[PDB]
């Protein structure tokens with residue numbers, strides 16, 4: 351819409367730091383580049399197959415017992431290493447993530463944490479076995495290595511408590527919490543998890559789980575977010591879902607995976623974070639592999655409109671979104687993370703959408719930091735003038751405009 355509305359939208363870079371380890375410094379550099387290019391948020395998966403975040407206190411109370419903090423940490427490290435024993439590291443610490451959140455805040459970048467369940471939770475499943483919780487895995491064509499059995503109360507109680515502890519930490523630090531719910535038991539059903547849930551009359555139980563996670567988020571002052579997969583599958587509403595969840599919409603699925611259309615979810619009142627699959631890059635994916643390789647993602651930042659929801663033609667279909675999310679995935683977590691690839695993709699998305707993205711405010715912030723905490727009244731009026739002239743509302747089309755403003759502040763400070 352208007353200048354104001356476009357800049358009000360979220361522009362998100364998503365990083366799969368669940369499957370693959372990222373150091374605090376790597377994530378800080380991603381925050382840096384996000385701020386420079388005019389993004390508003392970094393979406394950070396911390397639970398996604400691997401579980402790569404440990405709180406200082408991981409004491410868990412569930413099932414009428416307590417699991418000691420040291421036992422929980424040990425079990426999670428085991429689970430994550432079992433998924434993929436990343437040579438770069440295992441888990442981020444509470445101090446590291448606190449530091450990341452604060453660093454992002456200083457640059458007007460939000461953090462959006464994701465801890466995935468009941469799918470994409472390999473590490474949690476093994477962790478639960480280590481803690482004496484037998485058979486946490488769903489069991490269809492085979493025993494799943496990724497997905498929790500909704501009928502296992504002991505495991506369900508534990509995971510809810512675990513997610514609550516993470517939510518407790520993010521409460522008052524982040525606006526949004528993404529509980530995921532994508533791709534239920536894909537590994538055990540030939541990617542037909544929702545069909546299998548329905549077959550076994552467990553889709554109502556899946557809704558109950560998602561509805562609970564959504565209430566948990568809201569209760570702790572977090573906007574709940576989830577991927578679209580499990581919501582109103584096949585545009586049916588015999589089973590109801592919480593209407594306050596922000597939907598990260600990425601795909602309407604494929605043959606035999608009949609996800610609800612964005613039109614149908616819009617009719618149910620959902621708002622969307624446009625997480626179009628067209629923009630995906632999977633680390634190490636090459637043109638010969640098909641799917642989300644870098645050249646395709648980069649090309650799509652131009653071809654797929656900012657507001658275009660997957661499975662729809664924009665503006666012919668124009669559904670309300672709060673903004674858009676470009677996603678970096680680590681399906682094969684041993685693939686090398688090459689920061690410049692991610693930066694080029696991030697830059698392409700911003701360059702194709704200069705009206706949505708902010709200008710680069712880093713030079714300005716550095717310059718304001720030089721303001722001395724007994725000068726001429728003439729030299730002061732000028733510093734006040736240049737300061738008053740600063741414009742914090744500029745988009746990426748107006749970098750030269752901003753640079754001039756900053757230069758005037760530089761001169762006034764040096765003409766002190």
Ligand SMILES: C[C@H]1N[C@@H]2[C@@H](O)[C@H](O)[C@@H](CO)O[C@@H]2S1
Nearest residue numbers: 532533577600632679680681
């Ligand atoms: C919601 C996300 N679910 C899947 C994700 O785990 C994959 O990494 C990605 C790339 O294969 O594709 C989809 S998007």
Ligand SMILES: [Mg+2]
Nearest residue numbers: 491492493494
């Ligand atoms: Mg088996």
Ligand SMILES: [Mg+2]
Nearest residue numbers: 587590591618
């Ligand atoms: Mg309904």
Ligand SMILES: [Mg+2]
Nearest residue numbers: 625675676677
């Ligand atoms: Mg995307």
Ligand SMILES: [Mg+2]
Nearest residue numbers: 438685686687
């Ligand atoms: Mg690497």
